[PDB]
C-alpha cells in the first residue's frame with residue numbers, strides 16, 4: 001500500500017540476515033548500512049522482490065524502480081559475495097542522502 005509490503009519485507013529480511021534494528025537504523029541519516037548482516041539484509045530485499053538477475057546476479061535496478069543516466073553501470077555490478085553485490089549497487093546508485101532516507105523510512109519505520 002506500499003508501507004504494508006515493505007514492513008513485511010523488513011521483518012522477513014531481518015530474520016534471514018540476522019541484522020539488528022540498530023544496524024539497519026543507521027539509514028535514518030542517509031548512510032547506507034555497512035554491517036555484514038545489514039549488507040545481507042539488502043540482498044534479501046532484492047531477492048524477495050525478484051530484482052536479482054538469474055543469469056549473472058546483477059541487480060535489475062530498472063525493475064526495482066518500477067516497484068519503487070547511472071542505472072546501467074550500477075545494475076552491472078557483480079562481486080563474489082551476494083551481500084557485497086547488493087551493498088555496492090545501493091552505494092553506486094543511491095549516492096544522494098534523501099534517496100536513501102526515503103527507502104529507509106519505507107522499510108524501517110511504523
Ligand SMILES: CCCCCCCCCCCCCCCC(=O)O
Nearest residue numbers: 002005006024027045067090103104
Ligand atoms: C536499511 C534501508 C536501506 C536500504 C534500502 C535502499 C535500497 C533498496 C530498497 C528496497 C525497496 C523495497 C520496497 C519494495 C517492496 C514493494 O514493492 O512492495
